[PDB]
Amino acid sequence: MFEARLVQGSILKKVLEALKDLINEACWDISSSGVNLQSMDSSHVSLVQLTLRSEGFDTYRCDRNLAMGVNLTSMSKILKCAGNEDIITLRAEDNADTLALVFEAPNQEKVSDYEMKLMDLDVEQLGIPEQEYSCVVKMPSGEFARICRDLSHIGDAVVISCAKDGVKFSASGELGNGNIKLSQTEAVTIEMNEPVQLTFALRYLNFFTKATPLSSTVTLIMSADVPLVVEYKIADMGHLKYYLAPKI
Amino acid sequence: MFEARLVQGSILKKVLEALKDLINEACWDISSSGVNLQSMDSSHVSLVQLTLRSEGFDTYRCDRNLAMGVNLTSMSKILKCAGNEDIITLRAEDNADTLALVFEAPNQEKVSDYEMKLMDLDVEQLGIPEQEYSCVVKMPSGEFARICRDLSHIGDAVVISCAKDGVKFSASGELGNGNIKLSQTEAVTIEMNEPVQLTFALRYLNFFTKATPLSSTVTLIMSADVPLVVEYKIADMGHLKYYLAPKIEDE
Amino acid sequence: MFEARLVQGSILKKVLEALKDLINEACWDISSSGVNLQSMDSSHVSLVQLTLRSEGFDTYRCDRNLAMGVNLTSMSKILKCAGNEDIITLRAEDNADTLALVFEAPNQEKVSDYEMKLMDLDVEQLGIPEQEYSCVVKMPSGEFARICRDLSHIGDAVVISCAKDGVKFSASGELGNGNIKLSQTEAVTIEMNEPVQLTFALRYLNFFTKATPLSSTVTLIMSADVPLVVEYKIADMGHLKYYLAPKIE
């Protein structure tokens, strides 16, 4: 048996909202420590990793580890049927085949029960090398989303430069060019251990900022020659992290 | 002759909003007791009936019965020109041809006058079978609209099964299946005099829920072998009722 | 060297929003008295004129007159990158080629710098139409926008009839007709020096009401024989005026 009860169900809604634009299907790895999901995006450019610890659920039981193949488009459509204050319960039998989602309204007079067919996917885990923290930028998540949206009107790629005084986002295109300079202060903190200057495709960052509702801050972790990490904390539960390799 | 003054003009706006998605044209029957309208949908699947009693109007005068053929799209375009707090007056001369709508703002500095051409429509007598109240469900109108929208993501048809303790709405499709169970308590009341289980096309129920702004509650009246009634009360005036035949089973 | 600092940058955002539906490219004429723009719209029916006087800017310096050819679509995209409370500075070197727009948040922790390529345009050469103030109506801008939208559901043109006590807006089409009567009082004032009854295309007036955010009042200046003026004041700075001919003449 697998059964997990989450009183703040909107978390799951926001999680699915943050993944379906990027991934069509993926494996949810369920174990006694909680829920882990790792997947390349459907264009095989970026990597996504989700962690939800068992301690963040109001009830959690996992008799046997399972790897559930899920069409995220379908699961997101089902989670649109939950109200933002619903209690959400996931349940799956040993040897999978279907996953049940139960939404209990807080009045207690209405209960919704959805059953989703599970898919047959063979995906193997990619390893994540140890992180080098050359620059770490923590900033309001809405400000980062607006930065990416603004510069994608100028160009298709952003140059992120992190040096002692601050962090700069630059783009260049047919209409001209732009840059946005942030200095350390809705607080902005900058840990610069060695300067970095890297180029990234704005299309993928604009996908990553769909996780903005999960947290009021985002963390950017940059180092030379390794993927940028864009990370959102899922309070008292885990994280959603996106990895993106720099250009050229 | 005909003249009716309605101080809460937004009612008419909401009425037209609730009809234009289902029917294009309809005959407004005007008499001294008030306004009646009945029409099948443009696909002749569902039926709509509207009553606005003369007593719900602040002024009401009708010297001779009229059957006004109205393009509901045009009437809706005109009523979009009224503000939500406008006083709305309808006026028509004996033997019709046009309907006048006057919108008076509450400031009193602005008055709008619209004249709408009427049209010639074929009217087919339709009878309503007396209602059998096998199951009656009263619930918040917003909750019913959300139930219908949620399950139309799962499938195109909803099975409504009504039993002693409660009512269940079920759907099935690709993606899988879902059901939503309501128990008696934003109050939900369930009168089950005999069990009913019927299937209905979610597309038409989704048309019916465009009436949600007229009332905070909706009533579902279900019986075996007779069309479902989905009813919204128009407080202190009348009602909008929608009728939908169940889907026919296979074999 | 041209440099202009505007502490209420949202003015510039609203201006570009009020022009971009109507004009793709136009010349911004910069002089020591300020910023002037005039252009026919992209369909060559209506005329648009913008004035922003130097005194309205908190800083203003113009060493030499410039004619900056600007793609207004590009400029509006850049100005969407400014927040509504940003301080905006425009800057251009002598002999143009690019225009710099600097957006400073008021906390001072964020600064955005955009460089926009200018273009060489062959301007049409236009006079500003003659004025006669036969009738002048001042009214809330939102009410005027609502009148134009509502009647464009009835017909393609509005007949504006002006009398001493009030003004009437009428339209007619295949579904029927409508009129909206305003009397002099969110006040509407009417200076009627000669009676007027004039017809104008609602499609173009509906373009003009995109300037509604710049002002809570709009002024209609009507005459037989010269173009209607629809005017929005840009408070303590200038105006945006739209012109439409009453007749084909």
Author numbering:
A (entry chain C): 1 to 185, 193 to 255
B (entry chain A): 1 to 185, 193 to 258
C (entry chain B): 1 to 185, 193 to 256
Q: What does the original paper state about this entry?
A:
Proliferating cell nuclear antigen (PCNA) is an essential cofactor for DNA replication and repair, recruiting multiple proteins to their sites of action. The proliferating cell nuclear antigen (PCNA) has a central role during DNA replication, acting to recruit enzymes to the DNA replication fork, and to modify enzymatic activity and processivity. PCNA also regulates entry into S-phase via interactions with the cell cycle regulator p21 and the pre-replication complex component Cdt1. These PCNA partners all utilise a similar peptide motif to associate with PCNA, the PCNA-interacting-protein (PIP) box.
We examined the effects of the PCNAS228I mutation that causes PCNA-associated DNA repair disorder (PARD). Diffraction quality crystals in P43212 space group grew after 10 days at 20 °C, set up in a 1:1 protein:precipitant volume ratio with well buffer containing 2 M (NH4)2SO4 and 0.1 M NaOAc pH 4.5. Data up to 2.27 Å was collected on the i03 beamline at the Diamond Light Source, Didcot, UK. The overall structure of PCNA is retained by PCNAS228I, it is a recognisable toroidal trimer, with pseudo-6 fold symmetry and a central hole through which double-stranded DNA will fit. There is no evidence of trimer destabilisation, as the monomer–monomer interface appears unperturbed when compared to published structures of PCNAWT. The structure is of sufficient resolution that the electron density of the isoleucine substitution can be identified. The larger isoleucine side chain has a steric clash with Tyr133 in the standard position, forcing a 90° rotation of the sidechain of Tyr133, which in turn repositions a significant proportion of the IDCL (amino acids Gly127 to Asp120). The S228I change has very little effect on the overall structure and whilst the total rmsd between our S228I structure and wild type structure is 0.6 Å, the local rmsd averaged over the three IDCL regions (residues 120–130) is 1.9 Å. Many of the residues of PCNA that are most affected by the S228I change coincide with those IDCL residues sitting at the interface between PCNA and PIP box containing proteins, such as p21 and Fen1. It thus appears that this dramatic structural reorganisation of the IDCL, resulting from the single amino acid change in the PCNAS228I protein is likely to prevent this binding surface from operating correctly.
